[PDB]
Write a protein that binds this ligand. Sequence first.
Ligand SMILES: NC(=O)c1ccc[n+]([C@@H]2O[C@H](COP(=O)([O-])OP(=O)(O)OC[C@H]3O[C@@H](n4cnc5c(N)ncnc54)[C@H](OP(=O)(O)O)[C@@H]3O)[C@@H](O)[C@H]2O)c1
Ligand SMILES: CCc1nc(N)nc(N)c1C#C[C@@H](C)c1cc2c(c(-c3ccc(C(=O)O)cc3)c1)OCO2
Length: 157
Amino acid sequence: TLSILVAHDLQRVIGFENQLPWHLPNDLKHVKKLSTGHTLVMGRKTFESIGKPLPNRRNVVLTSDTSFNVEGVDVIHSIEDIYQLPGHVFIFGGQTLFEEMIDKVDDMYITVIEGKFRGDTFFPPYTFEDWEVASSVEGKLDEKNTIPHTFLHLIRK
Ligand SMILES: NC(=O)c1ccc[n+]([C@@H]2O[C@H](COP(=O)([O-])OP(=O)(O)OC[C@H]3O[C@@H](n4cnc5c(N)ncnc54)[C@H](OP(=O)(O)O)[C@@H]3O)[C@@H](O)[C@H]2O)c1
Ligand SMILES: CCc1nc(N)nc(N)c1C#C[C@@H](C)c1cc2c(c(-c3ccc(C(=O)O)cc3)c1)OCO2
């Protein structure tokens, strides 16, 4: 299975200055639950924002840089290499990879952050005409999680 995994706001903002625009611990938990034991594919800038590979899953970084070789990270140099990866593969970001892959993936795990943030990077537009809502779950708010959010699993029609 090839899936997108993304958090985007009401206007599809996903990033600002190579960081997440919001702080939302429950969404990190969400990512942890979905991707532990599986594979994340991410663009080079996304990897650099994190700085080190995420624990307990395969980290794959797409870059044109043949000098790229990071401990704990597998490198690919082409989109076509993604299709060779075994198991459940999550396209993890950022804007450029999402734009390249949204017409290719089987499904999308989207956390809709229900606010309007300043962004410089965006998830591409999509229509529910092409995507069935497998599930939609309102996130729980508390002291540590103060922005409303919804977990969507969308499957290509
Ligand atoms: N909210 C979320 O769910 C979420 C998730 C992930 C990322 N983000 C955000 O997204 C933003 C970054 O997105 P971005 O588009 O600027 O960067 P990006 O997609 O993470 O990285 C782009 C880089 O990936 C490499 N690349 C992409 N396609 C390639 C291809 N076909 N062949 C070879 N290399 C390829 C290139 O690296 P080289 O230039 O090294 O060749 C390119 O410069 C950040 O703000 C980050 O915080 C948000
Ligand atoms: C948690 C953010 C997020 N949510 C959703 N729904 N999809 C995504 N693709 C990303 C993402 C991402 C990258 C940019 C990112 C940025 C971070 C992160 C992480 C991150 C760190 C740890 C774990 C984990 O332990 O599983 C997961 C994501 C991941 O920590 C704070 O800054």
